[PDB]
Nucleic acid binder design. Sequence first.
DNA 1: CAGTCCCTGTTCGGGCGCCG
DNA 2: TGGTCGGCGCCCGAACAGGGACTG
Lengths: 411, 556
Amino acid sequence: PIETVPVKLKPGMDGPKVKQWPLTEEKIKALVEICTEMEKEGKISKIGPENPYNTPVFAIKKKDSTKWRKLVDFRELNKRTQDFWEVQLGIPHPAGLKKKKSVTVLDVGDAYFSVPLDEDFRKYTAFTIPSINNETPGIRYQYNVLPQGWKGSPAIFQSSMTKILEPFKKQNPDIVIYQYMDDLYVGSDLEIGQHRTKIEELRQHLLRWGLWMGYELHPDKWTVQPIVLPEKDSWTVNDIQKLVGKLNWASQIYPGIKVRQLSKLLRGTKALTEVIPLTEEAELELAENREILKEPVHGVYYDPSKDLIAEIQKQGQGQWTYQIYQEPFKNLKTGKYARMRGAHTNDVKQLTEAVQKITTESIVIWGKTPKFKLPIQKETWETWWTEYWQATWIPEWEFVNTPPLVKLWYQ
Amino acid sequence: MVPISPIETVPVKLKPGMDGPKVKQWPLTEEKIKALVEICTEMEKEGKISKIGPENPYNTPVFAIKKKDSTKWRKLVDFRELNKRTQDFWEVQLGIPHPAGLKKKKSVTVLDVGDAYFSVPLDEDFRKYTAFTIPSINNETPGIRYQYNVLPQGWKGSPAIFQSSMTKILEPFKKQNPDIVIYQYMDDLYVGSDLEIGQHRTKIEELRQHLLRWGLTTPDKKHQKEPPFLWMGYELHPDKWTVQPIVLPEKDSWTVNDICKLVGKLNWASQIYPGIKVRQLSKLLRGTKALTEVIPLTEEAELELAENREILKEPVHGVYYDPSKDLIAEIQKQGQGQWTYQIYQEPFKNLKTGKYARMRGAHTNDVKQLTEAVQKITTESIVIWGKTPKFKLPIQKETWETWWTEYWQATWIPEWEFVNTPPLVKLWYQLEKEPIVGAETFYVDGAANRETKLGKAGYVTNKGRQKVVPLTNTTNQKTELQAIYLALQDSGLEVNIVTNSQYALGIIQAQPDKSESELVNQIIEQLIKKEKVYLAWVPAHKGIGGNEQVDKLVSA
DNA sequence: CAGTCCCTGTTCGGGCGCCG
DNA sequence: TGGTCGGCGCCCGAACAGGGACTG
Ligand SMILES: Nc1ncnc2c1ncn2[C@H]1C[C@H](O)[C@@H](COP(=O)(O)OP(=O)(O)OP(=O)(O)O)O1
Ligand SMILES: OC[C@H]1O[C@@](CO)(O[C@H]2O[C@H](CO)[C@@H](O)[C@H](O)[C@H]2O)[C@@H](O)[C@@H]1O
Ligand SMILES: [Mg+2]
Ligand SMILES: [Mg+2]
């Protein structure tokens, strides 16, 4: 008996129509059990084929959880609601969250089930549950409450959320709380033990309003990956050719790069393995270059209107490099990931872990998720990615195939 | 209250701001008319159909065709214009059941609902739009106008509404009988239990009573008490299954439409019959105009077709699924980008077979294609069994390790072991990571004139070797490849090659063994003969070394 | 600095097979 | 006679996307 906030799609945009993909027997069993209870509790109810909208559903296990979590791929719906959760009921981003020594993330998604959902909107939350070997047709549902993973859920519940938060916030003014979809980011500068304790306090505070979370981030530890030039006692013609190509590409980012004196070293028509002594002019040109690469790019600043883009490169030996930007060659961050889960045995698990970590950093730093340019074949990613996914949100991605002429990002 | 209501209906709006169909009936031949008039008059007595006064301003064509393998006739309405204006549904049929999915059952019953579409009420408000006018032996007698009271055949909402309605009725029975397996596909029901045969039939009749309560009638004629059952085009036996026999046309002269049937039959056959190959038969269909046109069979499509028929000669069968035992998929390379696979649990007792022939990319190799086949098998298995089979693959463990670790794309194969069945899948050549000491260095380049299509490809080397070759009807890309081909032709067994072509370097670094382009194939041929190749890239127009010199030569 | 042309890869609708 | 609906599969060709290199 709570008022239902009306919702509408962006003008001229119909609802999502996205086929359900095949599910493993364990996931189908988990979903059937989860949906049976949710139907009993009135969160969802069965629907007919007259509803023409569908969204994909599957189940995940969060890190170390061992307990299945229902997950709906609302990316298509969220794109058609976009104006709602940005233009109107959205949330501001605490620029100070990235600065806190410790940040814990809590899944408050369950809270959203309390509030009900606009009756006119429920037609768009439809999802079909598949059956093994197509024994049965698809069992369709729709949401009667605020669904997890929809972008209207945290916005509609923001009024309710702040009141629940407000006693805690006054008690600790310094602590910073940010809400992104199903997640609550809690950033303190306290020592480890005090921090964990304050999270329990905010846990109880959530409990008496009608959920345990153990995912800890330390955004101050986070560093970047500078473009680096090799140090060599002696240089072959091949080494200088590689260096000139890397520096020339880098000059699209740092305009102060100069290759003239290094080019002079390769004037002839020379065998690649011939050793070339460096001249003083090249040593100094190389020195000045290494200094420039330590510096920042001029006039790189985040723009709230523009979308974030993430690019990833597979460097081999369990190493991955990524760049986050909005404009080409204006990079807001660049990083490297090594020795992740599945290192040296599974590229897809590692790429999946990389996408998650990068999305998390973007949420903390800018309160957005980037669109990923993934170095993988579309069919390889779609076959396996859900198997390794442990997050409650899902970024946008596209697939790219760039052979690497030069290793600019890695060494 | 002239018409009774039997089961819960489904609201069905029209597309907004649009109105019901009007279009005149077909000039139906009187012979068909005899069959139609008898059945249609019968419908009104049941309440399936109702007469309408001209207050109903809607007309939609009508026709009929005989039920296959029966004397009965099928009553079908060309609702193409009504579909266009009817609201969209979400189809609930997500795929086709496969017999290899089925577990062994002691007692199996297959039963068919009768007049299944005609037993499900159409939406009350929507009933008006059905209207059609019946025809007579002459054009003198007008014929009655009729509106459906139930789901009709030829509409676009009929299958989904029936399947959803059927599932709702079944759901209470399956909750009371958790240990009965009911495969529900349209109106065909497969019922299997480990109950002893007498007890199983008790449930079967009890299920028939449950369906009877909602007006669903299962005739004895389609009841299947005794094996082998006929289900979804398969023959089901207590311990095995097979496809119902497939007849392949014998024609001495083949048209285009002929090959399509043939191909499509062989694809249906390849789910159990191992080693079916359609590559050369499909080669005949590429870039043809008329479906009617006659085409002669090459000696490749003919040889293929010969052994394809002979594979079908011997009967084969699949077994059923044992959740206790592992799933195993084995793949063989069949040549010309053709792959077949077998999925089994006990050795030599196959659950099903299949083929992956898709040519993907202009340049590729066997390792990529094997990875594609693994993915297709994995997704297919998850549909049928909900798990990924263990893989037996004709590729050495070290070959795979070399490919995936070095490739720039994320790639992966699930748990698998090596099977030493030739032909083995391997990488034909390997590019060096570092420049080769004492090997001649070829600086290569090529250019071409966009207007004339004329160009040059050439090289310069540290030893002083040089070449420039004129080319006709080419492109910049093609000359950059040509330059590399020249360096490979004119070099010893070990060679360093420096190019500024990103296009060429990308093709060659992916280690392709096959290409659509003959020029790339010739480059491959040479790469295989070398002992060591180092390819390196430099940026053009930077005044680098040999690259500047060869650039001047080819630009001229 | 636009505007092409190459070249590649994706998508989508057509035909057939199969099931109601 | 030629003619309907939904699902899945294959193989095709055409239409479209987009990334580099080069032309003014
Ligand atoms: N060629 C078709 N065109 C349109 N719909 C069809 C066609 N064939 C089958 N269907 C649909 C409508 C049917 O109600 C349903 C089942 O078909 P089917 O079981 O073979 O016959 P039927 O149930 O209508 O009568 P019966 O069971 O007495 O043979 O599937
Ligand atoms: O991976 C592409 C594949 O995913 C689908 C559905 O899972 O689309 C989803 O992913 C896209 C790319 O991120 C989103 O743009 C889209 O909104 C989302 O549904 C399929 O549509 C597509 O084939
Ligand atoms: Mg029937
Ligand atoms: Mg040139």
